[model samples]
Target chain A: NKTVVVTTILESPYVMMKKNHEMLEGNERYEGYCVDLAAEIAKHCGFKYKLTIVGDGKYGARDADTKIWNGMVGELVYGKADIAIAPLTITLVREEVIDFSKPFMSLGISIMIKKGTPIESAEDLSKQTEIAYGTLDSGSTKEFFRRSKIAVFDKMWTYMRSAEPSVFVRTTAEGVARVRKSKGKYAYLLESTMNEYIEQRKPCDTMKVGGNLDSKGYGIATPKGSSLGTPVNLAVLKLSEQGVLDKLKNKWWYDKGECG
Target chain B: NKTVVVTTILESPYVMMKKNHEMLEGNERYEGYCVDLAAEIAKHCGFKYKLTIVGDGKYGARDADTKIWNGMVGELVYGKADIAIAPLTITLVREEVIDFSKPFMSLGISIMIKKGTPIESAEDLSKQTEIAYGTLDSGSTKEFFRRSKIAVFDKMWTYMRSAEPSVFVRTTAEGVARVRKSKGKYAYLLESTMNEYIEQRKPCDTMKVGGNLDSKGYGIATPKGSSLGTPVNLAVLKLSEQGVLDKLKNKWWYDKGECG
Candidate 1:
């Protein structure tokens, strides 16, 4: 009667379907970083949770014209989920509507380029016209450029928003695929956490370039003023100290790396 | 009538007394990363504050026999301070009694070796008996090794806990001085954030070696269940998203660096 409803998303290394998912039920149907984290969080906070994927397959964005929120964030706002445990970026706008634990993992906007592409920094991308680059649509990475007042980022945003054929991809996988298939002509701008994971995949044809453009982190999110916020946040800090977060990162990102 | 009291320490680059402090009064007498952050926090949370250095100048460690805490943490525990805005490391034992905001900065235990020292990592030092090493007394770095179950760190801790003539230093400056003057015969184990800052100072003979032994962060702390906790925590996340934290780091640590 008291199972917490958790809203998350389907993303490799964070959440992915098991090969025999049809043979499984409930939480057993999924696995990844967030899955393991959900278990750890539950154990620490002493709660029972039911994991549900976000129906819209979005990471939550507000449409300017409609004034409506969608994705996991919407689930929390509309009482569809009690909490969200995913690779959700902790943004100022989102923080206004929900409570986020201090970041479980820190990350930043970074560039992903095909191996040997010669691009090394955001400035290098901004100054060139030959290589096409863009970000995942309806995510923090896109909003980062759209709202940035910095010179280089603002300039990059101008080109991305007005570009023909839409450089934005609906998913991180789509963006990575484009980078690989476009040879040296396409680069993908995404969070360094995701970029680093993709760089270690089977093809190994891409590399995260230069330093991150900015710094931020991903937090476990709850509805504003939820009782679960305090306990969950404390659990994250505790896990960090015990090195559980780092160990999980290595297990998922490097231990089973396909390229290696 | 509603002034909040902040307890901090006089640590270089985080909280330091401005030269000619005798001519200034109250908050104006100090300037450093935490000083600037305290002002920003007060501005965001709509409060006034008085900055006071901890009376004991310790970062808080519970006495083994007396069960009493000291330093800024004690100031909060005993109702002597309303908040603590400092480079205090977030540890599990402290979290049981105090509330910590999401980390404003992340750090890890690391080794500091003088330039041209043959040592490259913690294991390197552990395997040899010549180069003596230790951590700041009454700090998280010391506790990390003391509590660690890992093979290399546990072995190192055994050596340090029983080492002759006392390997622990009372302050970071003392540990660094030991490193610089020991002619490569001593190493200092401390947080990477402080290690990097010292490496950039004049007479740059020390360098942070190897990847960090562990990952943790420093958080703004308050008495458990204080009303200020939520607002202050949110302010940290918001400031992080706005890039205010990064700007402050660069301003204090690198832009003002003496080596360059």
Candidate 2:
């Protein structure tokens, strides 16, 4: 029997390396929402699994000209992994190439500003230039602004594309760090789930402002026509129906919340 | 060119007959969220479609004994319709039989109580014998309780299964009417989207109470392996990203809200 290869990323509240990883081996080295989910999926679907972090550490995007995908999605597409169990956004371009289960979690693009900033909405940020803002590079948040035809978002994209010193950050932490250290000079645009998580951590100067810009979900992905698609999708739904997903959310995000 | 046969239901805020229906014809006779969504999908995907209400007006479920599919789902499965564009819940059973586009909207199982009902959560309803609660027959909400293994939901299901006078209602409207006329003796368990819509309508004595019991989304569905799945799925993602889905929700649920 072949062990299912689960490709994921190291992200807080989804998948994280345990602090005492040196004392553990194999799948025991990691823990979080996806870690717990992978176990449930395996138990329900009757498969053994191995969790491997994506080598490039990117969430996956295609090179505009080359048409090659990179990150966890690439791992699945290129046959380097059996399935991708991560906080991967299900988008049209990705869906064209891979099969995705029904969304395992819902999220939306949102603004993260240091508390007390004048910004109130995406519209507020778009109409001003004194405060700079950008999104996590190579992620859905950036893709949204880049692909948007909406007037406000198009305007924001125009400013971001030609801004000085490159507003794009390689990781969400970098975006948050820029916001924290800039003294209201920078704002980070990221997923609401990530924004809410960071807002509850220490140095709680950042707050998610306004309603989410767009709504979507993160889904477990498999290579096109993979057998795992049906079983895993059913497992996610069963877990969702059983309230395991909500329980896991509270366990990782609220129960261990540091701000309180 | 064959006109796509789109089967849906006549549920308020999703699909409703115009008061002046005698003067209208075809699609013009109805208007609501799904009607708008169907138009958007057709425009984006370059297809002509006809909207037909499901003959039986069910959300689709299989009988435990006969296993015959019914409602809009049946229409798709039996080739009576090419697609289903309604507030159809994306459930495991349905997905196994048909293809679902990415969710166009998110919702959850929620409790709808009369404005002054003392109940605040599912736990309260489960523990009480004084007030009765149930879900719509042949729907996902009812299935959730019937199949649930969770303690509170299981208890609630046990009570609902054999309750005197039958707690289950045939339609959401009937359930709401029961709640309205019961003097707080009945609480309806239904989808959050429908509950929220009813909360803003005239005779708005019902309110959605407590956090949702579970989270999921509504998706456009087609027969298994249909060519329409790819284009329709892309259209939904595009509309969702462009904020059209949010706009539709606002238009149908808020702009003309009678309660406000």
Candidate 3:
């Protein structure tokens, strides 16, 4: 089998994982959303592939100052990898720098926030009075909160710490329960997966109200000039049309139906 | 140094911002209902503090699977974060987990749309709905009409997905813009504060003219047994009695009165 460097990236019931490439030649070390999808795609395309991790961190954004692309998508932009898989989005900008396969799941940085939570971006809160906000304890998202010097977020943080009140959440479940009983306030920072999960459960008060915080999608990606692009695209289509992808999604998410 | 760890999460005109706001430039950056109230409490109690985001992200709730608490309330229970400076609504179930400050802001979800829109209530919007409608792309509001199992919302989502069309806008301003363009054909579903803000603006094409959707207010939340609870409560009461809350609302909302 013709093999290639297969770098992957990372969520909940949908992704159910991030790319784990510490070293795996077998199936047991990794599983769930992307792992299975990877296998199916590779099988359809008739190739053996390596599940690798794209080392750079950001989620496919270009630094205006550096003129550099970062994240798994970045790995492909250069020549370090051939195929980039995971819950990766097919953005117009990312599309230009690299190539992507067809859609696996629709994705976005959707808000799992509070009941009083209407301001969408960090800037909205920055200019106004009312509302304090923050992030998870630690993670890439944390980097967005603490490290990234993005203008809009920077404007908001000015208020998050400087204005007198501090805003940030501890855990996904905590964020959920916080809004449950408190007056209308908080952001669970949970995924649409777990959100819709709990929404279906008994204390059905909490629910996602708006579109995703950012609208995007997860697709397989390849190097900008890679030949695998054509077939990699085809396999994802086949998996989609054959109803296998939907079948797998149903297995992970709907199997419980929890407390009805 | 005696400092209390406060968690404020969410992007309302309440606990609002992030340099990343430049790290709320040290609490001087926070604004809104809860921010002002939290300041009054800290001043009265003589507690110097550090503002931090909760590791868990949420307003509050108990998880059935883990039987673990999550959100700001969870932090107080776990003794992780000391005080919560968010508007966590006061709910029956939530109080059992953590204590709340005397309420600062009571609230209910409401609807907003361009003036003269023929839709009212989920009932009115449900049938013969050509009046284009949409919620924030996704959130409790979006989920309300899109995926909610409740018959009213479910029926509304049913009409939204099928039937005439959608006027889904990402930013609240965009929703307003779309509503303006629709010429009495679009609807926006945001919490009432900003809804009211829009009502008092230019052209007056929009109005918050119906039954309140949901209601509650901001209460300074603290962990059960937290000594800050009483003082915070006292301060909130003091502020209300001192005409502070009214002054602040006028300062933020009314000071900008332009439309008439």
Stretches off by above 4 angstroms in model 3 are A1-260, B10-12, B18-24, B53-80, B131-186, B201-205
User: After superposition, which runs of candidate 2 have C-alpha atoms over 4 Å from their true positions?
Assistant: none
Candidate 1 wrongly placed segments (more than 4 Å): none
- Counted clashes in each candidate structure: 0, 0, 95
For candidate 2 chain B, the 10 contiguous residues with the lowest summed lDDT are B237-246
Model 1 scores a TM of 0.95
lDDT (0 to 1) per candidate: 0.91, 0.92, 0.61
Q: Whose lDDT is greatest here?
A: 2
Q: Look at candidate 1 and tell me the lDDT of residue B37.
A: 97
lDDT of 1 by residue, A1-260 (tens): 49999999999899999999999999999999999999999999999999999998999999899878899999999899999999999887898899898788889899999999989999999998889999988789998899888889999999999988789998888998999899899999999999889988988889999999887789999999999987898799788877799899999999878887
lDDT by residue for model 2 (B1-260), tens: 79999999989889999999999999999999999999999999999989999999898988779888899888998999999999999887788899999899999999999889999999999988989998898889999998988899999999999999999998988999999999999999999999999999988789999998899999999999999998999899878877899899999999979998
DockQ (C-alpha based) per candidate is: 0.58, 0.68, 0.01
Using lDDT as the yardstick, the better of models 2 and 3 is: 2
CA RMSD per model (angstroms): 1.8, 1.8, 22.3
Candidate scoring better on lDDT of 1 and 3? 1
- Whichever of 2 and 3 has more TM-score, that candidate is 2
Cα deviation of B54 in candidate 3 (Å)?
5.8
